[PDB]
Each structure stands twice: as C-alpha cells, then as structure tokens.
Amino acid sequence: EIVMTQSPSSLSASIGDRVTITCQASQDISTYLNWYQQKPGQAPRLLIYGASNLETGVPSRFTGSGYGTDFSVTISSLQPEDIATYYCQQYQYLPYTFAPGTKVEIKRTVAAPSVFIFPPSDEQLKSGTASVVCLLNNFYPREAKVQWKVDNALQSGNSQESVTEQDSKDSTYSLSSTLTLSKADYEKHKVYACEVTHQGLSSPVTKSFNRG
Amino acid sequence: VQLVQSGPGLVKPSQTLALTCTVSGASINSDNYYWTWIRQRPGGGLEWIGHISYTGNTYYTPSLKSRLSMSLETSQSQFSLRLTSVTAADSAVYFCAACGAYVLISNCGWFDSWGQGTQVTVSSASTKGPSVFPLAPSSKSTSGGTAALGCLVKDYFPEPVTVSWNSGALTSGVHTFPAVLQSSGLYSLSSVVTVPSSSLGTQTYICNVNHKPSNTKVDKRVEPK
Amino acid sequence: NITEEFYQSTCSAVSKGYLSALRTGWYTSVITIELSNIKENKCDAKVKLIKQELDKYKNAVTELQLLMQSAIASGVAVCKVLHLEGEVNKIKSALLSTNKAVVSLSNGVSVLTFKVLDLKNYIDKQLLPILNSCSISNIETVIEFQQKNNRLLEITREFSVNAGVTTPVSTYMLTNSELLSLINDMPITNDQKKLMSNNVQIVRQQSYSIMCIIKEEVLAYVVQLPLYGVIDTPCWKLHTSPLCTTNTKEGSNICLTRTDRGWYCDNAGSVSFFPQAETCKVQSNRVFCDTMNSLTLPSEVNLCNVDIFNPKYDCKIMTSKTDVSSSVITSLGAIVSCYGKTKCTASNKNRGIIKTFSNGCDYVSNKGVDTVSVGNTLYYVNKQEGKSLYVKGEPIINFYDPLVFPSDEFDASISQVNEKINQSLAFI
C-alpha cells in the first residue's frame, strides 16, 4: 500500500494570496494523482485529475503540477469559496489511497465575540435536567476560552463546547458552550456566568444571570 | 452522472451492512465505468473500499476482502455494497462514487461523480428521537440592535439531525453547531439565529428539527421571556 | 569481383568473391508510443472530422487491448518483464525528458528504449482544452492529428493480422531515420554500423517486431535486430546438377549428383553451411545469413570441389538411374544436364541460338547469353558482371562399373558407395 504525505497539515492565507499544497507519494506514481476539495457536510469534489488536468467547471485559478513522487496544487488567488479541506489521491497501483488532507482557513483581522447567555427553559426543567448555553458569536481567530462560574465557583467537567466551521461570508467563527446540571443542583444556586477570554478583548468579558 | 445513495444509518454490531447506489445519466453497463465505494471515518481522511466494473469484475481493498461483496443490478440501474461482521470501527460516512472515461488505458481513479453519502453508525444502542427546548431571547442575549435566539436539540441517537428555521424562509444569520457526544451515549447540538430585536413579538420564530433515523420531526416555537 | 568456376568432372559450379555478414546474435530495443487517456468527448464541419479521428483512435486502443488476451525467444523474454507491476512506470520515467534511453529491467537486462511517437502530449495541450468550445476553425490542427493517428492505426493493423509478431519490420514500426539512429547507438564496431546502414532493407527483413504490452497509456513493442558478428569472411555458393552416363539403350544409364548444395561461409576457422535456401539474402557481393540454420564443418570440406575422391573428407553424393534433363541457373552462367533426345540450346536475344549442347553435363557463361532452353522449359540467365572459369575434366560417373552401381542411395557418400560396390563385387 502506498503512503501519501500532504504538506502542510493546515494553512491560513489572506484573500487573494497564492496558496500551494504539496503532495508526496511513497514511490513513483507517474501522472496518476488527483486533487479533491471537500467542504463540511458535502461529498468531495474533483479539482485536478491526472496530476495537472483541470476538471470541467473548476475555476482557472487551480493549477496542478508534478510527476512521479512529488506533486503540488496551487490556488492563484485564494477566495472565500475555497475554505475547505484538500486531498490528493493516487491511482497507479491498487488499492487507491488518499493523503491525510490539508485544512485551509482564511486569515482576517481580529474580531471580538458577541457573547450571549441563555438560561434553561422551563420546559426542560420538568424533565429533570437543566442546560445553560453561552454563545460566542462571529469572532476571529478561532482560539477562545470559556469557563463557567456557578455562584463564583469554577465548574469543570460538566461543560461541552462546539465550534462552527469558518463562515465564508465574513471569515469568522462561532462557539457554543453548554453547562449541564440537574434540576436539584440548578435550584440550589443563584448566579450563573460564563467568562470569555479572547484576543480581541482587552479584558475578559462576563455574561451572567440570576434566579436559578 | 447523478448518484443517490440508499442505506441504513444504524447497524447492530457483528451484522452485515447493505448499501445501494442508484445511477442516473449512464447505463450500469456502459463502457469504461467503474462503480467505486469510499468511506470517511469521523474526523479523518478517506479510505477507498473497492470498485465493481461495468462488466462485473470486482476489486476489494486487501484489508476488507474477506468481508466485502459488490454486485450489479442492471435492471434497476444500481450497484450495491455488503460488509459483514461489522464492528464499531466501521462507523463512517460511506460514499458512492463513479469513474468513467471515453478512452481508458490506465486505472480509473478520478471520481468526478459522488453521492451525498450515508452516515453509518454501528452500535448496540437503540435509536432515540431528540427532545427540543427553546433558547428564549432576553436582555442577556441582546447586543444593541440585534438579538440572538435558538433551540437546543438534546438526547438523540444516532447522527445526523437536520435543523431548519421557519420551514426554510429564515436562512441569514443561522448557525447550527456540530453535534457533541455527551457523557451518555447520546448526542446534542444547538442552532442559533441572530435577529433584529425590534422584530421580537411581531414575527414568529420556529425551530424545525428532523431526525430521520427515528422518523422524528419536531417543531418548537421560540418566543421572548 | 564475383567469380565462378565450373567443374566438368563433377557437374557442379562454385561462385566465389562474396563477403559474409552472418547474424550471430540479437539486439532487443523497446519501442514505445505514448498514448493517452481521454476523459470525455462532448459537442461544425471541421470538428465533426476531428471526432471521426477520435473514433479511429478509440477503436485502435480497444483492438490492441483485445489483442493481449526460437527466433524471438529473446524478444518474448523482454515482453514478459514488461508485464510486471511498476516495470512500465520505470520506462515512463526514463523517457520523460528524452526519446532515447537505456533502461535496466528488474531482471538485470539493460535494454535501449525509444519513444517514437508522442500522442499524449499532443492531445492534452491542443485538443483537451477544446473538447470540453467545440469550435476549431483551422485545418492545420486537424491535419497533424490525422497524420499522427494514421501510424497508430497501421501499427495496430499489423499486430492484429500477425498475432503480435511481424516480419519484415515495416516503416510504420520504425521509420528510416529512427532505424538508422538505432543502428548508430548499437554496441557494435563502425564496420558493423556501416554495413547495416547501407543495407537497411535487408536489416528489416531479418528483424522482428514483437507486440508486448499496452498498459498505463504506453504501447510498447520490442524490435529485435540482427547482430552480424561475422563480417568480411569469404563466402561461396555451390550449385550441382545430375551427372549421368550417356549410353544409347534407355534405362541402362547411371547418375550421380553432389548433394549439400547451398551457401558456405568461412567462420572462425571452420565453414558455416546453410542447407535451407532463402535463409541467406544476397545484396551485391555481400551475403547475409542466419547461423541458427547452419552446420559447422571442417574447412577440408572445400576439397570436394578440387578433388572429390580425397581421403580426408567424405564428399556427399546421391545416386539414381533417372537420367532426366534439366538446367541450374548459377550466379554467372548456367549448368545444362542434357540427356536422351532432348534438344538443349542457349541463345542470345538478338543473335539467336549460339550454343547447342551435346549429351552430357556442360556449362555456358552469361556473356552474350540471355536465355537457355532445355526441352520445353525456358530459363533466363542472371546477367550480372563477373568472370567465369571452365575447369575441364572427365565426368566421374564414367569411373564406376554400372553392373555394381547402387542407384538407390539418396543420403550417401563416396566411401559408402565404395563400401557397397565392394560388397556386390565380392559376391561376384
């Protein structure tokens, strides 16, 4: 089985930049290398077939190069519609093998997150559990930190985060942190807060509510 | 060529996985067409499973040869895949794909056609429909002109869940997050919309959840206070 | 330069002055045509013509694919190596930036490789960008593809009607310029390079094209070329004809004919004898032969021409009592074996009959002679320039007593005939 190396693992570049991903095969595979583009929730899309040939319907700014063991794909000017993962795949020898991939992020100026906190719905409280959700909306870069304070007591191990993929419209991210408690524990305390730390904030921001 | 996949999302362990792909735009027996199967493990790369030729010749990846089966059903214009003695290591999104060429002198390795994919989860757990709770907007979720709101899709199995807002009329500002696997066996995800705050009380916001693995469709109104 | 001697005593003639070119080995080159993969074809009089050529190209590929479902033992061995995985890829890499390259195969054989036609490059830069605007308004792009594809169609035809093995090697397999440069790069002496270049038509006749593999857009056939490891040694051709007695009473005559007629060439202190005709090709005074169909004889075999009863080599003859008339047309004349009542003459075009043969075995040179007639069979003589020598001598058939002559020996010799004569005389 043929091992495929893709470099780099992930990259970020400004809009309009020249982006180049290289691909290396364990042994010579002639011109039999393809390039695929896969966005979240969708099947892969063939970009380049036969090392260099451009698939019908792909923008002209995609260029393929190489022969044998070393190949590369190049985006002449990076665009918002290119935020995806890129794979190279060989087909000289069966079984066909893919590379691990290359994530592509768009670089932009630092944007501070809009922080919102939601208390549990009364409908959920009947079931026996209580979930508090804290939302960080439209920030860049991706790196952000959220921690919960139930009556000024740092919580640990009862919260789960989730991050969106980079929005192609404004190149930002969103995050959702969910603090899960039982109804009994939830009604013993009064103040619930999420403390957000981000590079776009001069000092940490806190959103909290009462009546818990 | 158009490809549409049919298959179950949940499969019990040590069973057999049955997927079919229905082809449109070219005969299953047309020249130099190789019907390929590819699977993508969660958070990972792609793995080529095998293909079956327009004549019926089959190549299976050496790893899964003992457990793989592929056949052609020309009358219904579809080809199938069978993986037996499945375990939790076989949970992935299974992709129907096709390679075709006018003149072919090499392996057919370019996949210009794909299906949408089937999310196959292999667990001894049972399917469960989600419980949907509203995330009501208030002063703590208003920042100037716009206010945020959403719904919480909690305690379902298995993936995936489809979330809509106002039957599809509301699409701008919508952010549905990737699901998270909770400490129990079940999943949970959140969907959030940003909305002009002046519109609360005058416009209806309803969260449309569709979970096909359990024939579940839930509508929940999201209202202030 | 070509001379000839006729020996009246044995009714035979030796033509000498020829120079050898003996094929002793084989050189194997791998000739490749780079093909291509065509993803799609979708689309106007000019473009319609292009699509007809594309169909001929696709059909040719399919035919060659279907096709892939001792003199050439070496070529076939090279074809077997090409089927191993990765092997074709090695060639593809060697010929990436050049058309000529030496490639060592996986079994250690170092073969010369030659890309004679690059159809891959032509379709992927010219045609492929155009087949996915459909508007091709100049005639010169059409012409080049028709020219380049026509060769592929004929190569495919040849392999298709020869079960993958062709001879002579056509100019479709290897053009004159391609062949000439292949010869130039061969591991041979300048004398060998010169001989092959001045006789390219003979080289083609002694070569094989062996269809090998179509895999990974490469069509490859092996062209197996002769190696002439023996050059400029003397060669001679022995012609023989029946020698009979001429008694009046029919059926009372006995006959003798020297066997082993054919070409002889000096080779490494011995003489190479090629018993089956057509294996030698004569151009001018150079004679090209193939050593697999020869015997190696002591050089004393030559004595049968000067002294057929010598005690050192047992000259081969056949015997019979069938005194029929015939002629053997030689390099520089004609032997006439005229018996019974046959009228045998030699004539010139304009002068007419110039020699009338008497009963016996006789000879006439090609100087002033155009045809020879024996009975109702007209023979045209070869008119090449060269001097002949008539060596007079008593026909040796007169030295045998007809009462003890063995007329039923086909494969025989003087000593065997002597032995049998001795046995019949003992019982008398």
Short mmCIF file of N, CA, C and O in Angstrom, two decimals, chain C residues 67-166:
data_model
loop_
_atom_site.label_atom_id
_atom_site.label_comp_id
_atom_site.label_asym_id
_atom_site.label_seq_id
_atom_site.Cartn_x
_atom_site.Cartn_y
_atom_site.Cartn_z
N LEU C 67 -6.12 -7.63 -28.15
CA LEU C 67 -5.02 -8.40 -28.71
C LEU C 67 -4.25 -9.13 -27.61
O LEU C 67 -3.74 -10.23 -27.84
N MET C 68 -4.17 -8.56 -26.41
CA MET C 68 -3.37 -9.13 -25.33
C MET C 68 -4.19 -10.05 -24.44
O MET C 68 -3.93 -10.14 -23.23
N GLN C 69 -5.17 -10.74 -25.01
CA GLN C 69 -5.95 -11.74 -24.28
C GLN C 69 -5.89 -13.10 -24.97
O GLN C 69 -5.55 -13.20 -26.15
N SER C 70 14.14 -20.76 -30.56
CA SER C 70 13.23 -19.96 -31.38
C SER C 70 13.82 -18.60 -31.71
O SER C 70 14.65 -18.06 -30.97
N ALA C 71 13.37 -18.05 -32.84
CA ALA C 71 13.91 -16.80 -33.35
C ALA C 71 13.66 -15.62 -32.42
O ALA C 71 14.53 -14.76 -32.25
N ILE C 72 12.50 -15.58 -31.77
CA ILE C 72 12.13 -14.45 -30.92
C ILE C 72 12.12 -14.83 -29.44
O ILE C 72 11.42 -14.19 -28.66
N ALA C 73 12.87 -15.86 -29.06
CA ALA C 73 12.92 -16.24 -27.65
C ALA C 73 13.39 -15.08 -26.79
O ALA C 73 12.91 -14.89 -25.66
N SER C 74 14.35 -14.30 -27.29
CA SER C 74 14.90 -13.18 -26.52
C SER C 74 13.91 -12.02 -26.43
O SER C 74 13.75 -11.42 -25.36
N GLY C 75 13.28 -11.66 -27.55
CA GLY C 75 12.27 -10.61 -27.53
C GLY C 75 11.09 -10.93 -26.62
O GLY C 75 10.62 -10.06 -25.88
N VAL C 76 10.60 -12.16 -26.67
CA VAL C 76 9.48 -12.58 -25.83
C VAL C 76 9.85 -12.48 -24.36
O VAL C 76 9.02 -12.09 -23.52
N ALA C 77 11.09 -12.81 -24.01
CA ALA C 77 11.53 -12.71 -22.62
C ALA C 77 11.45 -11.26 -22.13
O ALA C 77 11.05 -11.01 -20.99
N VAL C 78 11.85 -10.31 -22.98
CA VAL C 78 11.77 -8.90 -22.62
C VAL C 78 10.31 -8.47 -22.45
O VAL C 78 9.98 -7.69 -21.55
N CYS C 79 9.40 -8.98 -23.30
CA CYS C 79 7.99 -8.64 -23.16
C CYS C 79 7.42 -9.13 -21.83
O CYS C 79 6.60 -8.45 -21.21
N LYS C 80 7.82 -10.32 -21.39
CA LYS C 80 7.37 -10.84 -20.10
C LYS C 80 7.76 -9.91 -18.96
O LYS C 80 6.97 -9.70 -18.03
N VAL C 81 8.97 -9.35 -19.00
CA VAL C 81 9.39 -8.45 -17.93
C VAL C 81 8.51 -7.20 -17.89
O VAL C 81 8.19 -6.69 -16.81
N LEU C 82 8.07 -6.72 -19.05
CA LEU C 82 7.23 -5.52 -19.11
C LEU C 82 5.86 -5.70 -18.46
O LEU C 82 5.19 -4.70 -18.20
N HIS C 83 5.41 -6.94 -18.22
CA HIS C 83 4.10 -7.09 -17.61
C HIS C 83 4.13 -6.96 -16.09
O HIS C 83 3.08 -6.74 -15.49
N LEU C 84 5.30 -7.09 -15.46
CA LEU C 84 5.38 -6.93 -14.02
C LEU C 84 5.01 -5.51 -13.60
O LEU C 84 5.28 -4.54 -14.31
N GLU C 85 4.38 -5.40 -12.43
CA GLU C 85 3.88 -4.11 -11.97
C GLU C 85 5.05 -3.16 -11.73
O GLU C 85 6.10 -3.56 -11.22
N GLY C 86 4.88 -1.89 -12.10
CA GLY C 86 5.90 -0.90 -11.94
C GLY C 86 6.90 -0.85 -13.07
O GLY C 86 7.61 0.15 -13.21
N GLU C 87 6.98 -1.91 -13.87
CA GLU C 87 8.01 -2.02 -14.89
C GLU C 87 7.80 -0.97 -15.97
O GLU C 87 8.75 -0.29 -16.38
N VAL C 88 6.57 -0.84 -16.45
CA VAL C 88 6.26 0.18 -17.45
C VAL C 88 6.53 1.57 -16.88
O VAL C 88 7.00 2.46 -17.59
N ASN C 89 6.25 1.76 -15.59
CA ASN C 89 6.48 3.06 -14.96
C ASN C 89 7.95 3.46 -15.01
O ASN C 89 8.27 4.65 -15.13
N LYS C 90 8.85 2.49 -14.90
CA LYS C 90 10.29 2.76 -15.00
C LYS C 90 10.62 3.37 -16.36
O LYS C 90 11.38 4.34 -16.45
N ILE C 91 10.10 2.76 -17.42
CA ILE C 91 10.30 3.26 -18.78
C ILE C 91 9.71 4.65 -18.93
O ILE C 91 10.33 5.56 -19.50
N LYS C 92 8.48 4.84 -18.43
CA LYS C 92 7.82 6.14 -18.49
C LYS C 92 8.68 7.23 -17.86
O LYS C 92 8.75 8.36 -18.37
N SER C 93 9.36 6.92 -16.75
CA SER C 93 10.20 7.93 -16.10
C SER C 93 11.47 8.17 -16.90
O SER C 93 11.94 9.31 -17.00
N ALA C 94 12.06 7.11 -17.45
CA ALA C 94 13.28 7.25 -18.24
C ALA C 94 13.07 8.14 -19.45
O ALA C 94 13.93 8.96 -19.80
N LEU C 95 11.92 8.01 -20.11
CA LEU C 95 11.65 8.72 -21.35
C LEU C 95 10.87 10.00 -21.11
O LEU C 95 10.21 10.51 -22.03
N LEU C 96 10.91 10.54 -19.89
CA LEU C 96 10.13 11.72 -19.58
C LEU C 96 10.64 12.93 -20.34
O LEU C 96 9.86 13.69 -20.93
N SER C 97 11.96 13.12 -20.36
CA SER C 97 12.58 14.30 -20.95
C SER C 97 13.40 13.99 -22.19
O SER C 97 14.00 14.91 -22.76
N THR C 98 13.45 12.74 -22.64
CA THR C 98 14.18 12.37 -23.84
C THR C 98 13.46 11.22 -24.52
O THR C 98 12.62 10.54 -23.91
N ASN C 99 13.79 11.00 -25.79
CA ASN C 99 13.16 9.96 -26.59
C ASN C 99 14.01 8.70 -26.65
O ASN C 99 13.50 7.64 -27.06
N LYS C 100 15.28 8.79 -26.27
CA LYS C 100 16.21 7.68 -26.29
C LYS C 100 16.73 7.50 -24.87
O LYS C 100 17.15 8.47 -24.24
N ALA C 101 16.69 6.27 -24.37
CA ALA C 101 17.20 6.00 -23.03
C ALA C 101 17.49 4.51 -22.89
O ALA C 101 16.79 3.67 -23.47
N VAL C 102 18.50 4.19 -22.09
CA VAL C 102 18.81 2.82 -21.72
C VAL C 102 18.14 2.57 -20.38
O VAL C 102 18.32 3.36 -19.44
N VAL C 103 17.41 1.47 -20.27
CA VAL C 103 16.72 1.14 -19.03
C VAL C 103 17.10 -0.27 -18.61
O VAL C 103 17.01 -1.21 -19.42
N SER C 104 17.52 -0.43 -17.36
CA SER C 104 17.77 -1.75 -16.80
C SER C 104 16.46 -2.28 -16.24
O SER C 104 15.82 -1.63 -15.41
N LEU C 105 16.06 -3.46 -16.72
CA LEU C 105 14.83 -4.08 -16.27
C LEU C 105 15.04 -4.77 -14.93
O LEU C 105 16.17 -4.89 -14.43
N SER C 106 13.94 -5.24 -14.33
CA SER C 106 14.02 -5.81 -12.99
C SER C 106 14.84 -7.09 -12.95
O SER C 106 15.32 -7.47 -11.88
N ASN C 107 15.01 -7.76 -14.08
CA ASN C 107 15.80 -8.99 -14.13
C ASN C 107 17.25 -8.73 -14.50
O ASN C 107 17.99 -9.68 -14.77
N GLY C 108 17.68 -7.47 -14.53
CA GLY C 108 19.05 -7.10 -14.80
C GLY C 108 19.38 -6.83 -16.25
O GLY C 108 20.49 -6.37 -16.55
N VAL C 109 18.45 -7.10 -17.18
CA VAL C 109 18.71 -6.85 -18.59
C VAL C 109 18.64 -5.36 -18.86
O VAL C 109 17.65 -4.69 -18.53
N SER C 110 19.69 -4.82 -19.48
CA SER C 110 19.77 -3.41 -19.82
C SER C 110 19.35 -3.27 -21.29
O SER C 110 20.09 -3.67 -22.19
N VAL C 111 18.17 -2.71 -21.51
CA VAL C 111 17.59 -2.53 -22.84
C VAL C 111 17.55 -1.06 -23.24
O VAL C 111 17.34 -0.18 -22.40
N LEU C 112 17.77 -0.81 -24.53
CA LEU C 112 17.60 0.51 -25.11
C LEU C 112 16.12 0.77 -25.37
O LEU C 112 15.42 -0.09 -25.93
N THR C 113 15.64 1.95 -24.99
CA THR C 113 14.23 2.30 -25.11
C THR C 113 14.11 3.54 -25.99
O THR C 113 14.96 4.43 -25.96
N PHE C 114 13.03 3.58 -26.77
CA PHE C 114 12.88 4.57 -27.82
C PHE C 114 11.42 4.99 -27.90
O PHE C 114 10.56 4.17 -28.22
N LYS C 115 11.13 6.26 -27.59
CA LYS C 115 9.80 6.83 -27.80
C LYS C 115 9.70 7.39 -29.21
O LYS C 115 10.30 8.43 -29.52
N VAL C 116 8.95 6.70 -30.08
CA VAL C 116 8.89 7.06 -31.49
C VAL C 116 7.70 7.94 -31.85
O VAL C 116 7.66 8.48 -32.96
N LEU C 117 6.73 8.11 -30.95
CA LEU C 117 5.55 8.91 -31.26
C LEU C 117 4.93 9.33 -29.94
O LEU C 117 4.60 8.47 -29.11
N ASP C 118 4.75 10.64 -29.73
CA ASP C 118 4.17 11.16 -28.50
C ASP C 118 2.76 11.71 -28.73
O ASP C 118 2.56 12.91 -28.95
N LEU C 119 1.76 10.82 -28.69
CA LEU C 119 0.37 11.25 -28.85
C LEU C 119 -0.23 11.84 -27.58
O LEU C 119 -1.20 12.61 -27.66
N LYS C 120 0.31 11.50 -26.41
CA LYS C 120 -0.17 12.04 -25.13
C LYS C 120 -0.02 13.56 -25.07
O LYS C 120 -0.98 14.28 -24.78
N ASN C 121 1.19 14.06 -25.35
CA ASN C 121 1.46 15.49 -25.32
C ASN C 121 0.57 16.25 -26.29
O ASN C 121 0.11 17.36 -25.99
N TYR C 122 0.33 15.68 -27.47
CA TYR C 122 -0.45 16.38 -28.48
C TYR C 122 -1.91 16.57 -28.08
O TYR C 122 -2.47 17.65 -28.29
N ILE C 123 -2.55 15.55 -27.50
CA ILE C 123 -3.97 15.69 -27.20
C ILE C 123 -4.24 16.55 -25.96
O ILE C 123 -5.17 17.37 -25.95
N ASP C 124 -3.43 16.40 -24.91
CA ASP C 124 -3.59 17.15 -23.66
C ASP C 124 -3.29 18.65 -23.72
O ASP C 124 -3.90 19.42 -22.97
N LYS C 125 -2.37 19.11 -24.57
CA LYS C 125 -2.26 20.56 -24.77
C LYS C 125 -3.09 21.21 -25.89
O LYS C 125 -3.66 22.28 -25.68
N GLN C 126 -3.18 20.59 -27.07
CA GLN C 126 -4.01 21.08 -28.17
C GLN C 126 -5.51 20.77 -28.07
O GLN C 126 -6.33 21.69 -28.01
N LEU C 127 -5.88 19.50 -28.04
CA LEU C 127 -7.28 19.08 -28.15
C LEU C 127 -8.06 19.14 -26.83
O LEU C 127 -9.18 19.66 -26.81
N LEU C 128 -7.52 18.60 -25.74
CA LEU C 128 -8.28 18.59 -24.49
C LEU C 128 -8.82 19.95 -24.05
O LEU C 128 -9.96 19.99 -23.56
N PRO C 129 -8.11 21.08 -24.15
CA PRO C 129 -8.75 22.36 -23.78
C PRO C 129 -9.97 22.69 -24.64
O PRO C 129 -10.86 23.42 -24.20
N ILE C 130 -10.02 22.15 -25.86
CA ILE C 130 -11.06 22.44 -26.84
C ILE C 130 -12.28 21.50 -26.81
O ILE C 130 -13.36 21.91 -27.25
N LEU C 131 -12.14 20.29 -26.28
CA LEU C 131 -13.23 19.31 -26.29
C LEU C 131 -14.21 19.41 -25.12
O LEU C 131 -15.18 18.63 -25.09
N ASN C 132 -14.02 20.30 -24.17
CA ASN C 132 -14.97 20.36 -23.05
C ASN C 132 -15.61 21.74 -22.96
O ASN C 132 -16.57 22.04 -23.68
N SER C 133 -14.90 24.48 -26.35
CA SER C 133 -15.68 25.47 -27.07
C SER C 133 -16.26 24.90 -28.36
O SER C 133 -17.12 25.51 -28.99
N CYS C 134 -15.76 23.73 -28.77
CA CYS C 134 -16.32 22.93 -29.86
C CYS C 134 -16.17 23.63 -31.20
O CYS C 134 -16.93 23.36 -32.13
N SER C 135 -15.18 24.51 -31.31
CA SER C 135 -15.06 25.45 -32.42
C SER C 135 -13.59 25.46 -32.81
O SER C 135 -12.76 26.03 -32.10
N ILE C 136 -13.28 24.83 -33.94
CA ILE C 136 -11.91 24.55 -34.35
C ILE C 136 -11.86 24.93 -35.83
O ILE C 136 -12.20 24.14 -36.71
N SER C 137 -11.50 26.18 -36.10
CA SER C 137 -11.72 26.74 -37.41
C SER C 137 -10.47 26.75 -38.27
O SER C 137 -10.45 27.44 -39.30
N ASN C 138 -9.43 26.01 -37.89
CA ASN C 138 -8.32 25.92 -38.81
C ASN C 138 -7.98 24.47 -39.10
O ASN C 138 -8.06 23.59 -38.23
N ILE C 139 -7.58 24.26 -40.35
CA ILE C 139 -7.30 22.96 -40.94
C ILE C 139 -5.99 22.30 -40.48
O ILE C 139 -5.89 21.07 -40.46
N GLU C 140 -5.00 23.10 -40.05
CA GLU C 140 -3.69 22.53 -39.70
C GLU C 140 -3.68 21.71 -38.41
O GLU C 140 -2.84 20.80 -38.27
N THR C 141 -4.58 21.98 -37.47
CA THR C 141 -4.62 21.14 -36.28
C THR C 141 -5.20 19.77 -36.63
O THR C 141 -4.70 18.73 -36.17
N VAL C 142 -6.25 19.76 -37.44
CA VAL C 142 -6.85 18.54 -37.99
C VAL C 142 -5.83 17.67 -38.70
O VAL C 142 -5.76 16.45 -38.48
N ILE C 143 -5.01 18.27 -39.58
CA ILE C 143 -4.03 17.50 -40.35
C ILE C 143 -3.02 16.80 -39.45
O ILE C 143 -2.71 15.62 -39.67
N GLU C 144 -2.48 17.49 -38.45
CA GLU C 144 -1.45 16.85 -37.65
C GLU C 144 -1.99 15.62 -36.93
O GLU C 144 -1.32 14.58 -36.87
N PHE C 145 -3.20 15.71 -36.37
CA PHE C 145 -3.78 14.55 -35.69
C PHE C 145 -4.02 13.40 -36.66
O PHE C 145 -3.75 12.24 -36.33
N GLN C 146 -4.53 13.69 -37.86
CA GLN C 146 -4.74 12.63 -38.85
C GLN C 146 -3.43 11.95 -39.23
O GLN C 146 -3.39 10.73 -39.39
N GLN C 147 -2.36 12.73 -39.36
CA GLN C 147 -1.06 12.17 -39.71
C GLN C 147 -0.54 11.28 -38.59
O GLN C 147 -0.11 10.15 -38.82
N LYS C 148 -0.60 11.79 -37.36
CA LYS C 148 -0.08 11.06 -36.21
C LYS C 148 -0.93 9.83 -35.91
O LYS C 148 -0.38 8.77 -35.58
N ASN C 149 -2.25 9.94 -36.02
CA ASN C 149 -3.08 8.78 -35.69
C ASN C 149 -2.99 7.71 -36.77
O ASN C 149 -3.19 6.53 -36.46
N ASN C 150 -2.74 8.09 -38.02
CA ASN C 150 -2.76 7.10 -39.09
C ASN C 150 -1.73 6.01 -38.82
O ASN C 150 -1.97 4.82 -39.08
N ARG C 151 -0.57 6.41 -38.29
CA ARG C 151 0.50 5.48 -37.96
C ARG C 151 0.07 4.49 -36.90
O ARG C 151 0.36 3.29 -36.98
N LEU C 152 -0.62 4.98 -35.86
CA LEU C 152 -1.12 4.10 -34.81
C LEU C 152 -2.08 3.07 -35.39
O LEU C 152 -2.03 1.89 -35.02
N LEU C 153 -2.96 3.50 -36.31
CA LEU C 153 -3.92 2.57 -36.90
C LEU C 153 -3.22 1.48 -37.69
O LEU C 153 -3.64 0.31 -37.66
N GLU C 154 -2.13 1.82 -38.39
CA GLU C 154 -1.47 0.80 -39.20
C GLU C 154 -0.65 -0.15 -38.32
O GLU C 154 -0.64 -1.36 -38.56
N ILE C 155 0.03 0.38 -37.31
CA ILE C 155 0.74 -0.48 -36.37
C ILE C 155 -0.23 -1.46 -35.74
O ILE C 155 0.04 -2.66 -35.62
N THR C 156 -1.40 -0.95 -35.32
CA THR C 156 -2.43 -1.81 -34.75
C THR C 156 -2.88 -2.86 -35.76
O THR C 156 -3.06 -4.03 -35.42
N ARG C 157 -3.07 -2.45 -37.02
CA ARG C 157 -3.44 -3.40 -38.06
C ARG C 157 -2.41 -4.52 -38.20
O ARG C 157 -2.76 -5.70 -38.24
N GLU C 158 -1.13 -4.15 -38.26
CA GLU C 158 -0.08 -5.15 -38.47
C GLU C 158 -0.06 -6.17 -37.34
O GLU C 158 0.02 -7.38 -37.59
N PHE C 159 -0.10 -5.71 -36.10
CA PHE C 159 -0.07 -6.65 -34.98
C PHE C 159 -1.33 -7.51 -34.99
O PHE C 159 -1.30 -8.69 -34.63
N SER C 160 -2.46 -6.91 -35.39
CA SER C 160 -3.75 -7.59 -35.41
C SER C 160 -3.81 -8.72 -36.45
O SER C 160 -4.53 -9.71 -36.24
N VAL C 161 -3.08 -8.60 -37.55
CA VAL C 161 -3.09 -9.62 -38.60
C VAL C 161 -1.83 -10.48 -38.57
O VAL C 161 -1.62 -11.30 -39.47
N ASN C 162 -1.00 -10.32 -37.55
CA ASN C 162 0.20 -11.14 -37.43
C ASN C 162 0.32 -11.79 -36.06
O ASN C 162 1.39 -12.32 -35.73
N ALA C 163 -0.77 -11.81 -35.28
CA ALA C 163 -0.79 -12.37 -33.93
C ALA C 163 0.38 -11.82 -33.10
O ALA C 163 1.09 -12.56 -32.41
N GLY C 164 0.56 -10.51 -33.18
CA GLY C 164 1.51 -9.78 -32.36
C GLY C 164 2.97 -9.93 -32.72
O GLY C 164 3.82 -9.43 -31.97
N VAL C 165 3.30 -10.58 -33.84
CA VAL C 165 4.69 -10.77 -34.26
C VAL C 165 4.79 -10.50 -35.75
O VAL C 165 4.21 -11.25 -36.55
N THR C 166 5.53 -9.47 -36.14
CA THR C 166 5.63 -9.09 -37.54
C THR C 166 7.07 -9.17 -38.02
O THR C 166 8.02 -8.93 -37.27
#
